[PDB]
Amino acid sequence: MSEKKQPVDEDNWDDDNVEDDFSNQLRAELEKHGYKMETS
Amino acid sequence: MYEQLKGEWNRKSPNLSKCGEELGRLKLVLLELNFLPTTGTKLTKQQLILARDILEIGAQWSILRKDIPSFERYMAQLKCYYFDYKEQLPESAYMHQLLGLNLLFLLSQNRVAEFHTELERLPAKDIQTNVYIKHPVSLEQYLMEGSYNKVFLAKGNIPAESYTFFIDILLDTIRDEIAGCIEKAYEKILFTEATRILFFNTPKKMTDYAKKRGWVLGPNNYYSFASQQQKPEDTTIPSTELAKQVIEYARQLEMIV
Amino acid sequence: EPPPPPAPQDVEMKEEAATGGGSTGEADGKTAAAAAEHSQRELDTVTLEDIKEHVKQLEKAVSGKEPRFVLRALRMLPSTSRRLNHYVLYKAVQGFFTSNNATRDFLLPFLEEPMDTEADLQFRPRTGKAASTPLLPEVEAYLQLLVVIFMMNSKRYKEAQKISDDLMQKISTQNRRALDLVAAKCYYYHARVYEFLDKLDVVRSFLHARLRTATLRHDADGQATLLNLLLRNYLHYSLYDQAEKLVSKSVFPEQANNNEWARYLYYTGRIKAIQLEYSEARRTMTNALRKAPQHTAVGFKQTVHKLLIVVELLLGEIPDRLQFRQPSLKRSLMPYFLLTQAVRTGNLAKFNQVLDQFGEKFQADGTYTLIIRLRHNVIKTGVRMISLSYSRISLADIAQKLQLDSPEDAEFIVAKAIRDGVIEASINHEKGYVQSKEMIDIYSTREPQLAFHQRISFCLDIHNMSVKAMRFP
Amino acid sequence: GIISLLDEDEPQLKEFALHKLNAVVNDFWAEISESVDKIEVLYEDEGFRSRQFAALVASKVFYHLGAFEESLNYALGAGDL
């Protein structure tokens, strides 16, 4: 055999793909896009 | 061995002369070796190489006469000639586009597990070489997404004129899907869209499809009506038969004490 | 060293003491086809042998068990247990006596020594143990040069244990099944000897011929161990043999070790990956995924999950996979975190940047049929997300918002979406309206009360599995 | 595949092909299961010589599948071979 080389050397696993979009993008999302109503 | 039976290599079959010579001559191969469940000294495999080439011309004669079971049967022979347990064979000039033939008609006959063991019996060489392998599988990506947009454009690119014969079978599996995917799944299409996708703009072929749906055409229109009637309900039949299932559920109360 | 002598003297005699001394009670336990209480214990300690010290990992003096135990392989009047106790006292040939090494040189007449000595009195686990345990714990030397045929010769005397197994003792041995356990393991060593440089051409018709002698008459676990071999060699070896199963599909009467049944359903579900039977594959590969929880901390569960979830990505939809994050997985980037990120996005440039950028690891995938409908899974994920979001959507929105260049291309994608039953859309083909809509009657009028024969058919199946489970004591 | 090849009216192709059958029978147990009807026709063809051998390897392949009783009836109607 089972080893042959290797003995010498509701959680996040659920969310990480949408939480990637909660990891790089849209930090102040409706707080600049929420500011589109009055800044524009 | 028989130095060259192919003395008319560019004069393959205007007749059935070398075809009958091919029946007697393949019959001579059958009398000689048999086939390849032979270890061989590679010199008895030399007429197996010539046997590969004359079964390539036997395939071209089988599509010349339109013998499809002997066509894919000789093609199955050629798949047994590359399934031949000695890979160490000389290289025939048709070695990849015979898999293009098998890929194309095997694509047109709607055998998709055969398409995947086609992509699996010799996977690694299907990517780079033979644009007649890369082009029917990217064309399979075109049948997957972007259909009815690249068929005749793809027909504009076959310089090795043996693939039009089976992309006409792909035209048949186009026309039945026009005969299932523009009417009786929508509301109404006008005459000009059936003119575009149903080519030659009024045969008795697009008429044959409009009447093949079981519907009578209007002027300058094809309604897709008269479908999905009565709002079916199955009134009390599951209330009968599912408690008929509860009967042998009480048998499951019976076998257990 | 002084610490190298005492340890194999201890654990080695603890192995054959319970092995021979307990298997004596097993075959003298005249009906023991399921007890085998030191057979499977012994194989549990042989999986421990491959981790730990072997028969003699050339343990720094002479590697002397091999010129010790297979000499006088004879189970006579019970002073031959004192011959093995002489083989306890002679373990100081390394320590006290003249050190004489006989590994790889005299091991072939040592393989002749179960035949050179007297009659084996019907305890073949010691002799086939002497046909496996010399050289298969020498696979770990990894030179595989002229000792391929030596380890193979030890499997030829194992084939002599097949001759003495199913060609001798014609009255209900029931050690035949334990020798199918040991025989199957050294068939995996036929893989670990043949398949390093060749293919198991003997065990093609001897795969089916050991299956022939292990078909119905005394078959137990040879069915799906030889079918694990049948299923596992014939994936790297060319296919259609899984269609050679399809005319003669025979699976276990009762499931084996849950590791074996787990990995077996992983193998045949991994065939249904390339067979593209997406319905059964998600539940038998889910079953196979959850059913093997024991693995080495650097992986093989990430191998089983990695090569598991590819067609699950190709279902058209997928959940966000498993639920137990692994960082050595994160170092190896095996099941493509970034590519399934490109799946749940409707992205194409970074998507084909993952495709083109990582193709040396797509070699480690070896399943390039993923991309040919996985770009299609990007566009069907887009139309499934937007169509699932909006009550009505039109080709003016989606057909060029997703840059399909034309109305009719989106009408072809919705043609394949209604063809797949995904959306209840409609298209007015007059002005360019996708006059899409959402169907009604989501209530529990009919559909869950129809589903409760699947829920409760499931429940009565677990009732009867609990009853049949109760039938054992 | 090599069993589908047998549309030639000369039976010596079928004896060549049974010479292939006992040769590469050690890998191809599946194809005769789709070629049962060919073993039925070539078995029920009287003057065709290979009906007895069709009962032989039909007893082999139905032995392989599990039709040991049709292997038995073919073993009856398989002759001295």
Side-chain angles (χ1 to χ4, degrees), chain A residues 2-40, chain B residues 2-257, chain C residues 2-473, chain D:
Chain A
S2 65
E3 65 276 13
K4 298 298 294 296
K5 184 174 72 68
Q6 60 192 359
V8 177
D9 293 331
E10 204 272 331
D11 292 331
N12 241 306
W13 235 104
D14 286 320
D15 201 10
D16 206 0
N17 196 342
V18 182
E19 197 268 330
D20 282 333
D21 202 8
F22 294 157
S23 293
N24 56 4
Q25 292 176 356
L26 60 97
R27 281 86 58 89
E29 172 59 27
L30 270 304
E31 297 88 8
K32 181 183 181 294
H33 296 85
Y35 294 180
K36 290 189 288 185
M37 298 176 185
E38 67 274 17
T39 60
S40 296
Chain B
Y2 298 97
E3 180 71 28
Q4 185 176 2
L5 64 100
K6 296 182 290 294
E8 296 297 327
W9 181 66
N10 55 359
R11 190 177 173 271
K12 299 164 78 75
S13 286
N15 289 316
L16 297 174
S17 177
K18 198 184 262 75
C19 298
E21 181 66 28
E22 185 70 28
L23 181 61
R25 177 68 182 87
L26 283 168
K27 190 66 178 176
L28 285 172
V29 178
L30 292 168
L31 266 67
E32 276 174 350
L33 199 43
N34 188 30
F35 193 67
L36 14 165
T38 303
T39 302
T41 328
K42 180 63 174 63
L43 294 175
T44 186
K45 293 183 182 292
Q46 292 302 109
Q47 73 267 17
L48 294 177
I49 302 304
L50 272 71
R52 291 193 297 116
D53 292 331
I54 67 173
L55 283 167
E56 289 174 352
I57 204 164
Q60 295 295 321
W61 291 345
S62 296
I63 197 60
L64 189 146
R65 72 186 68 189
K66 192 176 68 67
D67 195 357
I68 304 300
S70 296
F71 176 76
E72 68 185 1
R73 187 181 67 190
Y74 292 163
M75 185 61 213
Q77 288 171 351
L78 294 174
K79 187 175 70 67
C80 293
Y81 286 118
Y82 292 158
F83 181 73
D84 173 65
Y85 293 160
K86 297 292 184 181
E87 188 181 1
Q88 296 84 17
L89 298 174
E91 192 270 338
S92 178
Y94 291 97
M95 183 177 72
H96 295 286
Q97 65 268 21
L98 62 88
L99 278 79
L101 287 165
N102 195 3
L103 173 58
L104 186 66
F105 174 67
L106 180 144
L107 193 149
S108 298
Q109 67 182 0
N110 197 3
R111 296 294 184 271
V112 71
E114 293 292 327
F115 179 75
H116 292 92
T117 193
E118 191 274 335
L119 294 176
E120 184 65 29
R121 68 174 67 94
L122 290 174
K125 299 298 290 183
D126 291 336
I127 301 300
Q128 296 300 109
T129 187
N130 201 9
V131 68
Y132 301 116
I133 293 297
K134 183 175 71 177
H135 186 271
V137 299
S138 179
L139 182 63
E140 180 64 30
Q141 186 180 3
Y142 293 150
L143 269 68
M144 186 63 72
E145 54 90 20
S147 178
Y148 296 100
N149 296 318
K150 188 63 178 175
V151 173
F152 295 94
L153 298 176
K155 187 183 287 185
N157 192 4
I158 299 98
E161 184 64 25
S162 296
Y163 291 159
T164 308
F165 296 97
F166 303 110
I167 68 175
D168 290 330
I169 302 170
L170 190 146
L171 289 181
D172 195 5
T173 195
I174 278 171
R175 298 300 173 93
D176 61 359
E177 294 294 325
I178 301 169
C181 293
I182 199 67
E183 187 174 350
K184 63 91 178 179
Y186 295 105
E187 295 295 324
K188 67 197 187 79
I189 61 101
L190 197 144
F191 182 75
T192 190
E193 289 85 4
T195 296
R196 290 184 183 92
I197 294 97
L198 287 173
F199 292 90
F200 291 160
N201 72 22
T202 308
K204 277 78 177 174
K205 173 176 65 179
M206 66 182 285
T207 299
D208 197 9
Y209 293 155
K211 278 81 172 180
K212 186 180 179 181
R213 307 308 198 100
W215 180 74
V216 177
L217 87 168
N220 203 5
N221 194 359
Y222 297 105
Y223 298 101
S224 176
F225 288 169
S227 298
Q228 296 300 109
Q229 295 178 356
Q230 191 183 1
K231 184 68 176 177
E233 184 65 29
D234 294 331
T235 299
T236 54
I237 300 169
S239 68
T240 62
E241 66 186 2
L242 288 175
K244 301 292 189 292
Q245 301 287 316
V246 176
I247 291 173
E248 68 259 12
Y249 184 71
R251 186 175 177 86
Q252 297 176 0
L253 287 181
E254 185 65 39
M255 298 300 108
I256 293 96
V257 67
Chain C
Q9 292 179 356
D10 291 331
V11 301
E12 198 271 341
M13 187 58 204
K14 290 193 290 291
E15 285 172 352
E16 71 255 5
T19 307
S23 67
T24 301
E26 293 178 357
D28 288 333
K30 76 280 191 185
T31 60
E37 68 269 13
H38 293 171
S39 298
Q40 289 96 24
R41 178 67 64 194
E42 176 62 32
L43 294 173
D44 287 329
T45 61
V46 166
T47 57
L48 187 145
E49 284 176 354
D50 290 330
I51 300 168
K52 298 286 103 176
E53 290 86 4
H54 296 167
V55 26
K56 254 340 246 195
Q57 287 177 354
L58 295 170
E59 184 68 27
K60 292 186 286 294
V62 89
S63 172
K65 306 294 189 294
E66 299 86 0
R68 187 170 298 118
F69 286 88
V70 70
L71 281 76
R72 301 279 76 77
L74 60 97
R75 53 179 72 96
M76 293 298 172
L77 191 68
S79 297
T80 62
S81 66
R82 295 179 180 178
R83 266 73 166 176
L84 296 173
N85 289 319
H86 290 97
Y87 293 155
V88 178
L89 294 174
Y90 290 161
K91 293 179 181 180
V93 164
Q94 295 180 357
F96 293 166
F97 292 158
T98 62
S99 296
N100 291 317
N101 194 3
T103 60
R104 290 177 180 173
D105 294 331
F106 293 100
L107 283 181
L108 296 175
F110 287 165
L111 286 170
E112 295 178 353
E113 281 178 351
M115 296 301 291
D116 295 331
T117 58
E118 283 80 3
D120 290 332
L121 293 179
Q122 64 181 357
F123 292 105
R124 291 191 301 272
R126 184 180 64 85
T127 60
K129 181 173 70 67
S132 66
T133 61
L135 289 168
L136 304 178
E138 198 261 323
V139 174
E140 289 83 2
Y142 293 110
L143 52 88
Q144 299 293 318
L145 189 148
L146 188 143
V147 199
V148 166
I149 197 64
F150 287 167
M151 300 167 192
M152 182 56 217
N153 282 318
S154 66
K155 293 185 290 295
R156 296 289 185 191
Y157 291 97
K158 181 267 306 168
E159 288 174 353
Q161 295 295 320
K162 182 182 182 294
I163 296 166
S164 66
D165 194 8
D166 296 331
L167 280 75
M168 294 297 172
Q169 286 87 22
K170 278 81 174 177
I171 303 296
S172 295
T173 302
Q174 293 179 356
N175 291 321
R176 297 180 178 178
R177 294 177 178 181
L179 290 172
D180 291 333
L181 268 66
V182 179
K185 290 183 182 292
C186 64
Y187 294 154
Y188 291 110
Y189 289 108
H190 282 283
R192 290 182 180 93
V193 164
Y194 282 158
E195 291 183 353
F196 287 171
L197 50 92
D198 281 329
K199 61 190 184 293
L200 42 90
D201 288 328
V202 177
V203 205
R204 300 300 178 94
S205 180
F206 183 73
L207 185 59
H208 295 87
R210 182 60 171 173
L211 184 62
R212 178 67 71 194
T213 192
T215 299
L216 293 175
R217 50 99 180 174
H218 284 90
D219 193 4
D221 200 7
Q223 189 180 8
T225 50
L226 291 164
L227 186 56
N228 277 322
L229 299 167
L230 194 289
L231 214 162
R232 186 180 57 83
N233 194 10
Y234 292 164
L235 189 143
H236 181 74
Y237 185 77
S238 295
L239 269 68
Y240 181 74
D241 296 330
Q242 293 80 12
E244 194 272 332
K245 295 193 268 75
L246 294 178
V247 298
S248 296
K249 289 180 76 67
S250 296
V251 201
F252 275 157
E254 294 87 5
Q255 69 274 14
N257 194 5
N258 305 117
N259 193 5
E260 191 273 337
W261 186 260
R263 70 185 174 87
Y264 173 73
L265 269 66
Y266 179 70
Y267 288 127
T268 182
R270 198 180 68 250
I271 292 304
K272 293 184 290 295
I274 201 65
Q275 292 301 111
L276 272 72
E277 183 64 31
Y278 290 100
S279 177
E280 186 180 1
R282 61 178 180 87
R283 63 178 179 86
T284 191
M285 291 280 270
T286 296
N287 188 4
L289 184 63
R290 66 172 177 85
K291 196 179 174 65
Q294 294 301 109
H295 67 287
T296 310
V298 298
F300 290 163
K301 189 173 179 182
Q302 298 302 327
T303 303
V304 88
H305 181 271
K306 179 256 185 183
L307 189 60
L308 193 145
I309 57 98
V310 178
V311 290
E312 294 181 355
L313 289 166
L314 293 177
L315 297 168
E317 66 180 1
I318 194 183
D320 222 16
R321 293 182 183 174
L322 299 40
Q323 70 284 272
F324 51 88
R325 294 176 294 164
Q326 180 65 251
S328 293
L329 182 74
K330 183 179 71 68
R331 289 182 181 177
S332 56
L333 54 92
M334 293 290 288
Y336 288 97
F337 183 73
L338 185 60
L339 177 64
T340 185
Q341 178 54 243
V343 169
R344 293 296 295 163
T345 60
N347 197 356
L348 278 75
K350 178 68 177 175
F351 175 72
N352 295 117
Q353 184 179 1
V354 172
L355 174 67
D356 186 74
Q357 186 64 41
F358 293 153
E360 299 291 327
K361 190 61 180 175
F362 282 95
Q363 293 175 357
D365 295 333
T367 168
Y368 291 97
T369 63
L370 62 91
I371 189 69
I372 199 69
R373 66 185 59 83
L374 210 154
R375 183 175 176 86
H376 183 72
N377 198 2
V378 172
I379 195 65
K380 294 298 287 186
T381 302
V383 71
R384 186 178 295 111
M385 182 177 176
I386 297 169
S387 69
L388 190 146
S389 178
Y390 291 93
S391 178
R392 182 170 188 266
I393 199 64
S394 179
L395 51 88
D397 294 333
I398 191 166
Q400 290 82 19
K401 182 176 87 274
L402 291 181
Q403 64 183 358
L404 275 80
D405 203 12
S406 67
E408 69 272 15
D409 197 3
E411 293 173 354
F412 291 155
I413 301 301
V414 177
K416 293 181 181 179
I418 300 167
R419 180 66 64 193
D420 289 332
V422 175
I423 196 64
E424 200 260 329
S426 178
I427 293 95
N428 193 0
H429 293 93
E430 298 293 327
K431 297 182 178 68
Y433 290 108
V434 177
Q435 52 185 355
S436 59
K437 61 182 74 175
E438 297 294 327
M439 64 179 289
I440 60 170
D441 291 331
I442 202 66
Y443 183 72
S444 67
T445 296
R446 180 63 64 189
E447 180 66 31
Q449 71 183 357
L450 290 176
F452 291 154
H453 296 274
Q454 283 78 14
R455 273 73 174 266
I456 293 301
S457 73
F458 181 68
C459 288
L460 60 87
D461 286 332
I462 308 158
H463 283 92
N464 295 317
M465 290 303 107
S466 67
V467 169
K468 295 298 290 183
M470 192 189 283
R471 292 292 185 271
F472 293 104
Chain D
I2 57 98
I3 294 97
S4 67
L5 309 181
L6 297 177
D7 295 331
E8 182 180 1
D9 292 330
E10 280 80 1
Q12 57 183 355
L13 176 61
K14 280 82 172 176
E15 277 99 17
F16 289 162
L18 73 88
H19 189 201
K20 290 166 66 175
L21 283 175
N22 53 3
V24 295
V25 71
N26 54 359
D27 196 75
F28 289 159
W29 290 272
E31 185 63 30
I32 311 298
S33 300
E34 293 92 10
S35 174
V36 174
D37 54 351
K38 294 176 70 67
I39 305 300
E40 293 294 329
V41 171
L42 293 178
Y43 180 74
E44 293 296 326
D45 198 1
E46 296 179 354
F48 176 73
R49 297 178 61 86
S50 305
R51 57 176 292 167
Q52 291 84 16
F53 192 81
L56 260 69
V57 292
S59 292
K60 297 282 179 66
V61 68
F62 290 162
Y63 185 81
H64 178 78
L65 267 65
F68 299 100
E69 291 84 5
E70 191 66 32
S71 293
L72 179 58
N73 293 120
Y74 287 153
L76 266 58
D80 202 8
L81 296 174

